[PDB]
Design a protein around this ligand. Structure first.
Ligand SMILES: O=C(Cc1cncc2ccccc12)Nc1ccccc1
Ligand SMILES: O=C(Cc1cncc2ccccc12)Nc1ccccc1
Lengths: 304, 304
């Protein structure tokens, strides 16, 4: 028993982190096979970021201007190309520590592990969610760009996120491993607005199921509701509308607990309308939405 | 910016996890040099746990009864000994992945990373604190015994905890790497009581400093207090008494923010007496006590 915001073991990803330097800018890169992936803003100076013309900026750079260092050994750059907002530096040596991997574009609401890095060296690992507004609420300082988000399926690492920027509002924005930003964000020092951040309803429900499995049952009531009635309450509280897909996805948790999904929705509805009244659920005084139904099942079944 | 419950990168520890089997019981072991460390309750059956005589039980076991497996290769056991509540299985092969390491007994209030494992395979990593009552609020299922807690200083892993048991109350108990339980707990299936769990005051203060550094300043007031006045309020709320040592330890955070420690104590005092009034601090609706002042400084400075 017990319920924690658990991250995937980061060892497979640590073996891929390298330092990429371009002029005075140093950030992190991901070394997989003979390719180093990093944010393209490595080629920018503080002045360039205001309105950078990356194609023009990249033309002034040659293979030898990109210093790639894995641990203490220098990698030789034999090719460079820009794929959307990521630079792909072709190196002459394949990473001997390359794990089995995929590049995946995650959906909003999905979760992933972040290995926060500085100078190609990992400093910490934490679990987070892609917000419905496509931002992430991470913990990143300057130097952390190129730090990656991933999930692991037994031995295959699915790289889903590369950190690029912190918006003036303190939230984080980045790309998938093909250089495509999640959301409307651009890699430019300009006024960028994240949309309204809504609450991942299916995740909160999954976490309520985790609470019940772990003995915290105080919030369970004698009521039920319907999808349309629950959604009327969800919209008022800036919660994502719950669909039959979400109900089906909660099927295993509903079967494990013997509590119907709509019954859990009525409990959630009362928690929204009345608050926690000073009580806690799984050591939290608010409704947690950064555990998918898959994360709950995995944590409560010990998937290695 | 951003503040997350960050764990140390677990790669160095993953390379030490092995599976230890003794009869029908399989748990995790820590392989460092030519020694495998694991909970001594590996030699018990369900009936033994009621009142086990471990010296008598261990005598019926020989080197060949302890099956140690690292990945898919079997390790040959050439020696076995009991050191307090841990078994030390001497193997004939040194772990080629043994990192630089220390065995340290942590203090209550200190934090550490847990690499939760099942069948010698890691499943997740999370950050936690040794509670003042010496329990840990982890996420462990059956099979997780032998999972370790650690801290990293650049390249040296300091092993501080080995998971042994879940108390009937859902909290977790374990030992240091010398087999000594943290707290009054014994490795027996009996009624064991954890003391009153108090709140780590210095940690909450450090987290209030992290909040101020990260832009959350709403809780800052025009008041101050004294150590004795603050402690009068701390005792009422089951908070640890704050000492001059704690004030000194908060020195770097107080210098960074320009907010005196006693001024932060007055804010904490008002948060205790009046609650958060529906507001949040660093995305939390309660006072977080699982970040030491060292964790805050590290996270806010990017120590790799
Ligand atoms: O935002 C970043 C990098 C960054 C990321 N996370 C956290 C950061 C904290 C402080 C400084 C920088 C951080 N780059 C950038 C700079 C200007 C305009 C566009 C992008
Ligand atoms: O508590 C444990 C192992 C354990 C640990 N964490 C979580 C667990 C969850 C379920 C079952 C077992 C767990 N061993 C033990 C059994 C009986 C008496 C004394 C100790």
């Amino acid at each position: 028993s017990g319920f924690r915001k658990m991250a995937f073991p980061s060892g497979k990803v640590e073996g891929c982190m390298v330092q990429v330097t371009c002029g005075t800018t140093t950030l992190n890169g991901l070394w997989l096979d003979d390719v180093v992936y990093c944010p393209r803003h490595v080629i920018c100076t503080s002045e360039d970021m205001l309105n950078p013309n990356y194609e023009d900026l990249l033309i002034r750079k040659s293979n030898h201007n990109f210093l790639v260092q894995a641990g203490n050994v220098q990698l030789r750059v034999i090719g460079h190309s820009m794929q959307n907002c990521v630079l792909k530096l072709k190196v002459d040596t394949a990473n001997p520590k390359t794990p089995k991997y995929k590049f995946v574009r995650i959906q909003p609401g999905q979760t992933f592990s972040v290995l926060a890095c500085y100078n190609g060296s990992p400093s910490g690992v934490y679990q987070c969610a892609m917000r419905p507004n496509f931002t992430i609420k991470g913990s990143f300082l300057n130097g952390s760009c190129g730090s990656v988000g991933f999930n692991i399926d037994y031995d295959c690492v699915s790289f889903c996120y590369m950190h690029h920027m912190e918006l003036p509002t303190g939230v984080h924005a980045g790309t998938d491993l093909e250089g495509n930003f999640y959301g409307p964000f651009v890699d430019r020092q300009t006024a960028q607005a994240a949309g309204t951040d809504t609450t991942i309803t299916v995740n909160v429900l999954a976490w309520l199921y985790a609470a019940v499995i772990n003995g915290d049952r105080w919030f369970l009531n004698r009521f039920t509701t319907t999808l349309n009635d629950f959604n009327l309450v969800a919209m008022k509280y800036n919660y994502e509308p719950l669909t039959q897909d979400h109900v089906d996805i909660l099927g295993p948790l509903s079967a494990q607990t013997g509590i119907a999904v709509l019954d859990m929705c009525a409990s959630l509805k009362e928690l929204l309308q009345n608050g926690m009244n000073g009580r806690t659920i799984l050591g939290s005084a608010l409704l947690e939405d950064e555990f998918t139904p898959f994360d709950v099942v995995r944590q409560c079944s010990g998937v290695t």
